[PDB]
PDB file of all heavy atoms in Angstrom:
ATOM      1  N   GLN B  12      37.969 100.878 152.120  1.00  3.48           N
ATOM      2  CA  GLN B  12      36.699 100.877 152.856  1.00  3.48           C
ATOM      3  C   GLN B  12      36.094 102.274 152.963  1.00  3.48           C
ATOM      4  O   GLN B  12      34.877 102.419 152.900  1.00  3.48           O
ATOM      5  CB  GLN B  12      36.860 100.270 154.248  1.00  3.48           C
ATOM      6  CG  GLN B  12      36.905  98.751 154.250  1.00  3.48           C
ATOM      7  CD  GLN B  12      37.178  98.167 155.629  1.00  3.48           C
ATOM      8  OE1 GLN B  12      37.832  98.786 156.472  1.00  3.48           O
ATOM      9  NE2 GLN B  12      36.681  96.956 155.860  1.00  3.48           N
ATOM     10  N   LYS B  43      44.099 123.654 127.143  1.00  2.00           N
ATOM     11  CA  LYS B  43      44.730 124.432 126.063  1.00  2.00           C
ATOM     12  C   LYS B  43      44.794 125.923 126.392  1.00  2.00           C
ATOM     13  O   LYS B  43      45.864 126.540 126.328  1.00  2.00           O
ATOM     14  CB  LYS B  43      43.969 124.251 124.744  1.00  2.00           C
ATOM     15  CG  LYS B  43      44.206 122.921 124.053  1.00  2.00           C
ATOM     16  CD  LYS B  43      43.534 122.894 122.689  1.00  2.00           C
ATOM     17  CE  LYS B  43      43.539 121.497 122.083  1.00  2.00           C
ATOM     18  NZ  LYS B  43      42.702 120.528 122.846  1.00  2.00           N
ATOM     19  N   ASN B  46      47.077 126.669 129.724  1.00  2.00           N
ATOM     20  CA  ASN B  46      48.525 126.431 129.593  1.00  2.00           C
ATOM     21  C   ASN B  46      49.262 127.561 128.872  1.00  2.00           C
ATOM     22  O   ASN B  46      50.393 127.894 129.240  1.00  2.00           O
ATOM     23  CB  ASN B  46      48.806 125.089 128.890  1.00  2.00           C
ATOM     24  CG  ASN B  46      48.508 123.875 129.769  1.00  2.00           C
ATOM     25  OD1 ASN B  46      48.669 122.736 129.330  1.00  2.00           O
ATOM     26  ND2 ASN B  46      48.081 124.106 131.005  1.00  2.00           N
ATOM     27  N   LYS B  47      48.614 128.161 127.875  1.00  2.00           N
ATOM     28  CA  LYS B  47      49.096 129.413 127.262  1.00  2.00           C
ATOM     29  C   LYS B  47      49.343 130.523 128.292  1.00  2.00           C
ATOM     30  O   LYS B  47      50.233 131.357 128.110  1.00  2.00           O
ATOM     31  CB  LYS B  47      48.100 129.924 126.215  1.00  2.00           C
ATOM     32  CG  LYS B  47      47.989 129.067 124.962  1.00  2.00           C
ATOM     33  CD  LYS B  47      46.765 129.437 124.135  1.00  2.00           C
ATOM     34  CE  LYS B  47      46.398 128.331 123.162  1.00  2.00           C
ATOM     35  NZ  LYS B  47      45.125 128.624 122.446  1.00  2.00           N
ATOM     36  N   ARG B  49      50.299 130.052 131.496  1.00  2.00           N
ATOM     37  CA  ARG B  49      51.135 129.563 132.596  1.00  2.00           C
ATOM     38  C   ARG B  49      51.834 130.727 133.316  1.00  2.00           C
ATOM     39  O   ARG B  49      52.294 131.664 132.657  1.00  2.00           O
ATOM     40  CB  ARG B  49      52.190 128.561 132.097  1.00  2.00           C
ATOM     41  CG  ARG B  49      52.018 127.167 132.661  1.00  2.00           C
ATOM     42  CD  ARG B  49      53.059 126.196 132.129  1.00  2.00           C
ATOM     43  NE  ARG B  49      52.978 124.894 132.799  1.00  2.00           N
ATOM     44  CZ  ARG B  49      52.200 123.871 132.433  1.00  2.00           C
ATOM     45  NH1 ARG B  49      51.390 123.946 131.373  1.00  2.00           N
ATOM     46  NH2 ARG B  49      52.231 122.743 133.143  1.00  2.00           N
ATOM     47  N   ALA B  64      67.187 145.767 135.731  1.00  2.00           N
ATOM     48  CA  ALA B  64      68.276 146.604 136.261  1.00  2.00           C
ATOM     49  C   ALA B  64      69.124 147.240 135.154  1.00  2.00           C
ATOM     50  O   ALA B  64      69.498 148.412 135.251  1.00  2.00           O
ATOM     51  CB  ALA B  64      69.161 145.796 137.201  1.00  2.00           C
ATOM     52  N   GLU B  69      69.541 153.100 133.567  1.00  2.00           N
ATOM     53  CA  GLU B  69      70.400 153.757 132.582  1.00  2.00           C
ATOM     54  C   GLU B  69      69.613 154.805 131.797  1.00  2.00           C
ATOM     55  O   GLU B  69      70.091 155.924 131.606  1.00  2.00           O
ATOM     56  CB  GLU B  69      71.021 152.724 131.629  1.00  2.00           C
ATOM     57  CG  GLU B  69      72.126 151.875 132.253  1.00  2.00           C
ATOM     58  CD  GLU B  69      71.638 150.893 133.310  1.00  2.00           C
ATOM     59  OE1 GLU B  69      70.432 150.880 133.639  1.00  2.00           O
ATOM     60  OE2 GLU B  69      72.467 150.110 133.813  1.00  2.00           O
ATOM     61  N   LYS B  71      65.525 155.116 131.914  1.00  2.00           N
ATOM     62  CA  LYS B  71      64.234 155.597 132.423  1.00  2.00           C
ATOM     63  C   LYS B  71      63.368 154.475 133.005  1.00  2.00           C
ATOM     64  O   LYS B  71      63.797 153.324 133.062  1.00  2.00           O
ATOM     65  CB  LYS B  71      63.466 156.313 131.311  1.00  2.00           C
ATOM     66  CG  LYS B  71      64.118 157.605 130.840  1.00  2.00           C
ATOM     67  CD  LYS B  71      63.318 158.251 129.721  1.00  2.00           C
ATOM     68  CE  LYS B  71      63.954 159.553 129.266  1.00  2.00           C
ATOM     69  NZ  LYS B  71      63.194 160.185 128.153  1.00  2.00           N
ATOM     70  N   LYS B  73      59.902 152.984 135.684  1.00  2.00           N
ATOM     71  CA  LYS B  73      59.715 152.449 137.043  1.00  2.00           C
ATOM     72  C   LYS B  73      59.549 150.922 137.047  1.00  2.00           C
ATOM     73  O   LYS B  73      58.753 150.379 137.819  1.00  2.00           O
ATOM     74  CB  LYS B  73      58.503 153.103 137.706  1.00  2.00           C
ATOM     75  CG  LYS B  73      58.673 154.589 137.986  1.00  2.00           C
ATOM     76  CD  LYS B  73      57.426 155.179 138.621  1.00  2.00           C
ATOM     77  CE  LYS B  73      57.605 156.657 138.922  1.00  2.00           C
ATOM     78  NZ  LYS B  73      56.381 157.255 139.523  1.00  2.00           N
ATOM     79  N   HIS B  89      42.875 134.293 147.490  1.00  2.00           N
ATOM     80  CA  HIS B  89      42.963 135.250 146.397  1.00  2.00           C
ATOM     81  C   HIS B  89      41.798 135.131 145.403  1.00  2.00           C
ATOM     82  O   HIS B  89      41.212 136.143 145.013  1.00  2.00           O
ATOM     83  CB  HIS B  89      44.298 135.063 145.679  1.00  2.00           C
ATOM     84  CG  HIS B  89      44.554 136.063 144.600  1.00  2.00           C
ATOM     85  ND1 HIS B  89      45.019 135.703 143.355  1.00  2.00           N
ATOM     86  CD2 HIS B  89      44.415 137.409 144.575  1.00  2.00           C
ATOM     87  CE1 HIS B  89      45.157 136.783 142.609  1.00  2.00           C
ATOM     88  NE2 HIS B  89      44.797 137.832 143.326  1.00  2.00           N
ATOM     89  N   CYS B 121      29.869 131.240 143.713  1.00  2.00           N
ATOM     90  CA  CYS B 121      29.984 131.596 142.295  1.00  2.00           C
ATOM     91  C   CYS B 121      28.623 131.866 141.653  1.00  2.00           C
ATOM     92  O   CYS B 121      28.469 132.834 140.905  1.00  2.00           O
ATOM     93  CB  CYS B 121      30.709 130.491 141.517  1.00  2.00           C
ATOM     94  SG  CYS B 121      32.458 130.297 141.940  1.00  2.00           S
ATOM     95  N   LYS B 134      42.854 117.623 141.315  1.00  8.33           N
ATOM     96  CA  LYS B 134      43.574 118.796 141.826  1.00  8.33           C
ATOM     97  C   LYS B 134      45.033 118.839 141.371  1.00  8.33           C
ATOM     98  O   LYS B 134      45.603 119.917 141.230  1.00  8.33           O
ATOM     99  CB  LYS B 134      43.483 118.877 143.359  1.00  8.33           C
ATOM    100  CG  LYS B 134      44.176 117.772 144.141  1.00  8.33           C
ATOM    101  CD  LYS B 134      44.042 118.014 145.633  1.00  8.33           C
ATOM    102  CE  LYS B 134      44.458 116.788 146.430  1.00  8.33           C
ATOM    103  NZ  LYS B 134      43.443 115.699 146.369  1.00  8.33           N
ATOM    104  N   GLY B 138      47.340 121.844 139.654  1.00  8.21           N
ATOM    105  CA  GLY B 138      48.716 122.064 140.085  1.00  8.21           C
ATOM    106  C   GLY B 138      49.707 122.209 138.944  1.00  8.21           C
ATOM    107  O   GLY B 138      50.575 123.087 138.988  1.00  8.21           O
ATOM    108  N   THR B 145      49.676 120.647 143.967  1.00  6.22           N
ATOM    109  CA  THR B 145      48.203 120.699 143.911  1.00  6.22           C
ATOM    110  C   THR B 145      47.734 122.139 144.066  1.00  6.22           C
ATOM    111  O   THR B 145      48.318 122.879 144.859  1.00  6.22           O
ATOM    112  CB  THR B 145      47.547 119.868 145.042  1.00  6.22           C
ATOM    113  OG1 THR B 145      47.586 120.594 146.279  1.00  6.22           O
ATOM    114  CG2 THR B 145      48.236 118.510 145.234  1.00  6.22           C
ATOM    115  N   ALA B 156      44.154 139.917 123.667  1.00  2.00           N
ATOM    116  CA  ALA B 156      43.153 140.268 122.651  1.00  2.00           C
ATOM    117  C   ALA B 156      42.919 139.127 121.659  1.00  2.00           C
ATOM    118  O   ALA B 156      41.773 138.816 121.329  1.00  2.00           O
ATOM    119  CB  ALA B 156      43.562 141.537 121.913  1.00  2.00           C
TER     120      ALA B 156
END
Side-chain angles (χ1 to χ4, degrees):
Chain B
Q12 282 175 331
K43 284 186 190 66
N46 287 179
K47 291 166 198 174
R49 244 179 173 88
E69 287 69 357
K71 294 179 179 179
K73 293 179 179 179
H89 185 226
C121 292
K134 66 178 168 286
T145 79

